[PDB]
Amino acid sequence: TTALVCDNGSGLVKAGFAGDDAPRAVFPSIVGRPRHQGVMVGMGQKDSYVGDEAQSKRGILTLKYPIEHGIITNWDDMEKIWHHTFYNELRVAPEEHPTLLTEAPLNPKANREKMTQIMFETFNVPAMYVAIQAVLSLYASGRTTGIVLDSGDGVTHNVPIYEGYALPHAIMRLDLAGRDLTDYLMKILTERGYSFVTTAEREIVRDIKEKLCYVALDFENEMATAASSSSLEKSYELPDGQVITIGNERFRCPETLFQPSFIGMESAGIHETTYNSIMKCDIDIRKDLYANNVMSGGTTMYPGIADRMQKEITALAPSTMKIKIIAPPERKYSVWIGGSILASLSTFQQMWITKQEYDEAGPSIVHRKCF
Amino acid sequence: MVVEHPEFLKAGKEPGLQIWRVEKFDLVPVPTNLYGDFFTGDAYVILKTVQLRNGNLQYDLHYWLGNECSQDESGAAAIFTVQLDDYLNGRAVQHREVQGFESATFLGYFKSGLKYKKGGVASGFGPTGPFKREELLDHLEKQAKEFKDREDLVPYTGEKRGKVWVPK
Ligand SMILES: Nc1ncnc2c1ncn2[C@@H]1O[C@H](COP(=O)(O)OP(=O)(O)OP(=O)(O)O)[C@@H](O)[C@H]1O
Ligand SMILES: [Ca+2]
Ligand SMILES: [Ca+2]
Ligand SMILES: [Ca+2]
């Protein structure tokens, strides 16, 4: 009997089998429906697409994302994604597999219940469990105490965790993450004369972002280097063989994480929210948080971000603090890997919500068993 | 809950030192004659139980991570530690111990001095001139035109396969 692990994010589904060291299926968390092309369709037609297909056909589809800022908001399309994940990507019968799902920090009670309800009533799973994403990442790093910076495509959180459990009162949420950074990079490339603003061009912008962007250790110094020389420029080959040149856009883009005002957001940057989160915690545990800042999620992947965070937190913290930033190379999948480990433990068997427990108690059991 | 694992049932029942090694996603006791001889390719969980004068037992849980241990082992050691603490009603103080950086307290559990040895149990894991935008767009569209829909899909119909829960 093999359990499934599904880590649903705003941008990407990570799904696979408990016990594997990585998700077997990683694909866009999107449902696409055809745009009008001049004639009313015209039935019997595939009226929807999910994941990789939807992305490939984005030019002629309108895309919807069922998860917004890490929270499930379109339940109909979320069910479609889960269905597609089981049957068309993992190719399993859900009724044959205990299923571990993940959730955002501070996920509303009603949402946890609906997830539970859908897994049992729609997919007839034999058992299920819901774990907090940042906590899984912390476990994946081999720690029970630390503060996670989890930053994906739709949301960034600071989550302090002590002796295994998140401290909800100190969690910080920032609605600024990878999609905003892609939008911003598109904007500043347009400023430079490269207008990549249609859905067809979006993937070019994401690729430039993931390949060429980096966090400067000292931003304003870096800006001066870029103005004073061509030493930071990179050429980039477009899919049609055209070659473009980009300069200070490389580090301006993720600077936004530290300076959200670059895209007009009034929020403090991720170094300040990290500090503010720690400062909401008991003084007695702060030392352990400072020494265990764990980065999780794809938007923490920028080269130089760990060193930059190390610098900023050091400036904010008492000089007596040992500051350490942990940024595993596999951190695009650290949530998923933590779930894979958890669901594999000999001790996890009695932790699942079983079908029978659900059929007797109903969705509210999730608040007592997934805690 | 609760974890019904045989080693949980034994944990912290009396004053002493108990050591387990993570082996393929399980918590396996270490033979007592090998206490203190740590495989650097492995992760361990250590429970020190001390009799308090008030009659209660005091608990310190240490999870020890060898330099070469795999991510499944270190992750499991951390999770087992949380689980054991919860089983012991949250009373245990948790400690992360890294090879080469162990606490004085942990080192003091081993009166002949702890020793390292290489090895361990295997992981449980199974240029072109000015930018011509029109040219780029034509290319992208040509690529898109050639994309064919998957024909192998199980269609989503919104069918409910499980039993609908009704309150009593
Ligand atoms: N090397 C990289 N550099 C910068 N960003 C990256 C890199 N690799 C991935 N990303 C970004 O990470 C995001 C996806 O990460 P992840 O899978 O952690 O997010 P998610 O779980 O879908 O979103 P969220 O947690 O916000 O709900 C995308 O914005 C993607 O462009
Ligand atoms: Ca995520
Ligand atoms: Ca090992
Ligand atoms: Ca405790």
For chain B, give every domain's residue range: 1-168
Instruction: Please count the structural domains in chain A.
Output: 4
- Assess whether A8 and A111 both reside in one domain: yes
The pair phi, psi for residue B34, each rounded to 5°, is -110, 5
This PDB structure is determined at a resolution in Å of 1.8
Distance CA A9, CA A102 (A): 9
The pair phi, psi for residue A344, each rounded to 5°, is -85, -15
Angle at Cα A220 formed by Cα A218 and Cα A221, nearest 5°? 65
Q: Which CATH architecture has domain B1-168?
A: 3-Layer(aba) Sandwich (3.40)
Overall residue count recorded for chain A in this entry: 371
- Assess whether A294 and A341 both reside in one domain: no
Query: How far is ligand 2, taken at its centre, from the CA of residue B155, in Å?
Result: 27
The pair phi, psi for residue A71, each rounded to 5°, is -100, 130
CATH number at residue A210: 3.90.640.10
CB contacts under 8 A, B 57-116 vs A, are: 63, 65, 71-72, 74-83, 85-86, 90, 94, 96
The alpha carbon of residue B120 is apart from the nearest alpha carbon of chain A, in Å, by 18
Distance CA B72, CA B25 (A): 7
Distance CA B42, CA B118 (A): 9
- Assess whether A169 and A192 both reside in one domain: no
**Contact call for residues A30 and A13 (beta carbons, < 8 A):** no
**Contact call for residues A316 and A271 (beta carbons, < 8 A):** yes
Q: In the numeric block, which tokens belong to residue A247? A: 């300069």
Query: How far is ligand 2, taken at its centre, from the CA of residue B16, in Å?
Result: 42
- Look up residue A259 and give its amino acid: Q
Distance CA A101, CA A122 (A): 15
Of A210, A255, A257, the one to substitute when testing ligand 1's pocket (max ligand atoms within 8 A of C-beta) is: A210
Is beta strand A31-34 parallel, antiparallel or unpaired with respect to A49-50? antiparallel
- HSE-up of residue B26 (Cα within 13 Å, Cβ side): 12
- Assess whether A25 and A36 both reside in one domain: no
Q: Which domain holds residue A311?
A: 132-177+267-328
- Assess whether A89 and A218 both reside in one domain: no
- Assess whether A299 and A202 both reside in one domain: no
Residue finishing a domain among A213, A243, A263: A263
Nearest to A54 by CA among B159, B146, B150: B150
- Assess whether A138 and A74 both reside in one domain: no
- Determine if residue A358 is left, alpha or beta; phi over 0 gives left, psi from -120 to 50 gives alpha, anything else beta: alpha
Distance CA B157, CA B138 (A): 36
**Which parts of B are annotated binding residues?**
41-42, 73, 85, 90, 92, 111-118, 121
- Assess whether A281 and A146 both reside in one domain: yes
The alpha carbon of residue B95 is apart from the nearest alpha carbon of chain A, in Å, by 9
Instruction: Give kind and range of the element (H or E) at residue A140.
Output: helix A133-140
- Assess whether A151 and A256 both reside in one domain: no
- How does DSSP assign A164-230, residue by residue? TEE-GGG-EEES--HHHHHHHHHHHHHHHT----SGGGHHHHHHHHHHH----SSHHHHHHHHHH-S
**Contact call for residues A74 and A64 (beta carbons, < 8 A):** yes
Distance CA A351, CA B97 (A): 27
CATH number at residue A364: 3.30.420.40
- Assess whether A78 and A59 both reside in one domain: no
- Assess whether A349 and A246 both reside in one domain: no
| Method used to determine the 3D structure | X-ray
